[PDB]
Amino acid sequence: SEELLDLFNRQVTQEFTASQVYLSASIWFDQNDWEGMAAYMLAESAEEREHGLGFVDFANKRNIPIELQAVPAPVSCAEWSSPEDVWQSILELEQANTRSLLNLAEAASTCHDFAVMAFLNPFHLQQVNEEDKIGSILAKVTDENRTPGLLRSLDVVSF
Amino acid sequence: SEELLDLFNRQVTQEFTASQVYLSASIWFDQNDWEGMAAYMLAESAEEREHGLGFVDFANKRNIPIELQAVPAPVSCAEWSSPEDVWQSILELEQANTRSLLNLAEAASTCHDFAVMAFLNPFHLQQVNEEDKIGSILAKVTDENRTPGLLRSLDVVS
Amino acid sequence: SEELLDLFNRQVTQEFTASQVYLSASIWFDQNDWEGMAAYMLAESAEEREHGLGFVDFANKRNIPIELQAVPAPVSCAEWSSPEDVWQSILELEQANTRSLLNLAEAASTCHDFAVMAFLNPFHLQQVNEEDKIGSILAKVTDENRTPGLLRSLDVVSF
Amino acid sequence: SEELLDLFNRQVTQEFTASQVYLSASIWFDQNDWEGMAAYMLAESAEEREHGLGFVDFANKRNIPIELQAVPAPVSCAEWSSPEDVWQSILELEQANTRSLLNLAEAASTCHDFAVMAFLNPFHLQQVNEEDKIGSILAKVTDENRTPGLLRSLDVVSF
Amino acid sequence: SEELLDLFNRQVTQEFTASQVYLSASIWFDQNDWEGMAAYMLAESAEEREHGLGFVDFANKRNIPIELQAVPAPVSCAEWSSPEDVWQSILELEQANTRSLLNLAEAASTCHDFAVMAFLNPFHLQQVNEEDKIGSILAKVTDENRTPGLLRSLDVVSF
């Protein structure tokens, strides 16, 4: 039982960590004049925070004690040099969000905790959609940036 | 891994196979002047195809490689002689569809694939409603067909 | 009689075969993150199926026996490497759909089957429009794919 | 008056018993694919429960202490084998609801309890309508059942 | 071409002759209290006469001289003794309407009369629909009339 409660708290920290990492991507894009990509990252930052809030609200109803941890400073931004590097780090953050949800579901399954498994279902499905979407933007970014200035089209036109 | 990817491909084929079986039922119904029952099978033909398309879409998102198989020819139509024969085959078909989804679910469960299991849930609930609905139509058809001509009312009225 | 009833029956198979080949093109484009082209292919997949159902409905009314045949596995997806390969196969598919309608119309003509010939007219005119449309897309695709990444703009903007 | 309070409590039990019996008739109809007759019995199960609730509410206002009794398991569904058996039990159930209301009215008349008698008047008139309606459905069912399949054809149309 | 002018005129006669047969059918139905089938025949009588007027109008524009012939007295009503007999005569009437359109189309094809062939196309397709519809009513009529009274119950609902 302690494992399930530890992993449920770690999931809150992970959603807030993701929210701050998206915010850091927004900043890098804005500073580098990619306002389209920056807006997208900003909206994602707010959505991850809403996921964290959704976990906190469920935990409070189900008497899972929550203790909020530090949200660590985003670290990938110091080394990003092009939009491709940012999008790659965001794909990896979403892959880590998915694994963290699957580990929680595993612990809930071992405990037979049917309510926690039910609560997690839409998040597992949303992660499928999100990794697919990011993977697809990253494919387009990597392809368009083979021609100088062309990626600048993606930002301005789409996003 | 392997068993799970293979069963997910097979589910796509099972949905499209069922689609064609429902089309073959519409045809038998139309050819034999049961327009109401033919409309109903035609709608279900479109629906099974949409179920297959939904599995393809999920597989593409989840990087489950799909390769489309041949869709087999329906075989039951040569033997159907009355509407009870057709609704009986359709009941068997939905039973096989449910079985298909359950085997896929068992595979996902052994792999701890929570995303695939969550994706399947609405389909397991839909199949309960579908087998019930077809079972129920089959019961009326079998009862009304005990009087010459009476079943034509079911078709025409509903 | 025999030749005509046979060709009519097989036109249904040709339309469903084309529906499955469009679906396979949609899958290849989705798996390679060309979502806009995948959506166009998925829509044609539905439309080819509606053509087949149009043939089946006419055959039922005209007492032409329909026996539904296996719908062959699509096979060009094994060797597609780029969007041009896919659109080229789709062009060939529609050229074959056209030839199969003209063969049918040729048999109806020989049979003096006026009703069947009238039934086919709008399909002949639709195949004109469809070959022109696919030929035009393929011309754009081939030209744009001369510069790396540029084709990825067609998909994102149009489609 | 002990007898008045006793009969008022028994009326509550009879309405909830009728509610459960109607629900058992819904279940037997549903299990045997008579969805229309099942919907009708389900609606009647809800209505009987509302009668019981209106007696509870009146008793609380009038200071008649209600003690809720067991609602017995419906047992006639063990023996129903056709819709005629079901409707016949339902006719007998409504005849019993009429008798229990008339017993209560007699006790209230004895006690000169004008408020209780005024409260019961709409239920007396409702029971007249209910018994007539169930008697009439039973006559239709019995008649249509003389021809195999004919009854089914009218579950489907009416109800 | 004399043959084409003759056949075009005969087509007008055939449409009005069909109109009168439909009227005769309506009458037999109304006299025997089949008001729904009678209404369907009256509707068809008016539609056949409209076909006839469409041929006349086209002939007038195309300078095909129309000489209106006697419309023969309908004779099948002499022998009808149930609805099946009427619907079978109506089927054979639409089969003969189809044949006469096909004879006309054949003469037009021989003369390379493209405008007449184009004019006939929707009639060919309409006759497919009509033979199907009447064939299907006749199958239902034949089947329901195997149980005494049952046919009546479905003039009353459908129609």
Ligand SMILES: [Fe+3]
């Ligand atoms: Fe998240």
Ligand SMILES: [Fe+3]
């Ligand atoms: Fe996210």
Ligand SMILES: [Fe+3]
């Ligand atoms: Fe399905």
Ligand SMILES: [Fe+3]
């Ligand atoms: Fe289904």
Ligand SMILES: [Fe+3]
């Ligand atoms: Fe087509």
Ligand SMILES: [Fe+3]
């Ligand atoms: Fe096409």
Ligand SMILES: [Fe+3]
């Ligand atoms: Fe009551």
Ligand SMILES: [Fe+3]
């Ligand atoms: Fe009642």
Ligand SMILES: [Fe+3]
């Ligand atoms: Fe006509």
Ligand SMILES: [Fe+3]
């Ligand atoms: Fe006509």
